[model samples]
Target: GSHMEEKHMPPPNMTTNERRVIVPADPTLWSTDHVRQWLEWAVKEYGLPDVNILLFQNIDGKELCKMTKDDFQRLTPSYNADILLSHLHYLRETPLP
Candidate 1:
């Protein structure tokens, strides 16, 4: 039943340059807490605070949560596809208050 089948699966056969964003099973509005968590995750994952800010600019962290993969790509063109995909997954999976 529900246990055997996967609820959310990332795209198959994605290369380093052609990754698709993974949507959350349940979507929610973002909070400041979510933004902080994302920044923390980004610093650890990318090993650069400056890069993280560059990647997350334009979009107010306190305002939005769910965005399309293409939108994210447009915002963060300098980042690698894998990094972008991981960020999307983090945004999808993380809990917000």
Candidate 2:
């Protein structure tokens, strides 16, 4: 025999940030595609002089997350490392689903 209990659930309807992007919600889960999407978005937001759109090509989000200023600058002559680091900080601090 089993006891029956009343169901307790909340509304499934919800609202979130406007979905202009289709990238992964978690940076740790982002693939190279998502990384590029983020890079493109960052470029616009930060006014990054991303003349070479491929600067971040071949890099995935996990690799990106681990990059230091040295790593970024070494990847290319990126004074843009400063901006990249700032975005990384923001992404890490305010993650969404």
Candidate 3:
């Protein structure tokens, strides 16, 4: 009897070892622009049918102004959801622009 180890099958014609860039940041200097940059990079690098992305954001600007569900909606791009989600998640993990 021959013993065989189980291995997770990878996608066809797929090369492993993807690259990623992550960084923590200070909230003070952070801005919406940072989110924009990451989004552009992901879409450009990943290209079509490569991978998907998601993003989410919150607003804590005005004092005594409680952020609402609508606020998150604004943070969301009126454009692509996946792209916006990806950018939002990236911003959440990273420092604001």
> Best TM-score goes to which candidate?
2
- For every candidate in turn, the CA RMSD to the true structure comes to 13.3, 12.4, 17.2
Q: What lDDT score belongs to each candidate, Candidate 1 first?
A: 0.41, 0.60, 0.34
Q: Can you write out model 3's per-residue Cα lDDT over 6-94, one digit (the tens) per residue?
A: 22211222121123332223222222333333444656664533333233222111210233334434544334445434444444454
Candidate 2, superposed: residue stretches over 4 Å from native: 1-20, 76-78
Instruction: Put down candidate 1 lDDT per residue, 1-97, tens digits, no spaces.
Output: 4673332322321122212222222223323343434444556667643344444433433333445555555544445434645665654464432
Clashes of 3: 10
What C-alpha lDDT, on a 0 to 100 scale, does residue 5 get in candidate 1? 38
Q: Report residue 29 deviation for candidate 1 (angstroms).
A: 4.2
The 10 consecutive residues of candidate 3 with the worst lDDT sum are 9-18
lDDT for each residue of candidate 2 in 1-97, tens digit (9 for 90 to 100)? 4454222211222122226444444454455666676677777787878334476766776788787877777644466777876667666565555
User: Candidate 3: where are CA atoms >4 Å away?
Assistant: 1-30, 48-79, 90-97
After TM-score superposition, the amount by which residue 89's alpha carbon in candidate 2 deviates from its true location, in angstroms, is: 2.0
Q: Give per-model TM-scores.
A: 0.37, 0.63, 0.28
Which pairs of residues have clashing backbones in candidate 2?
A: none
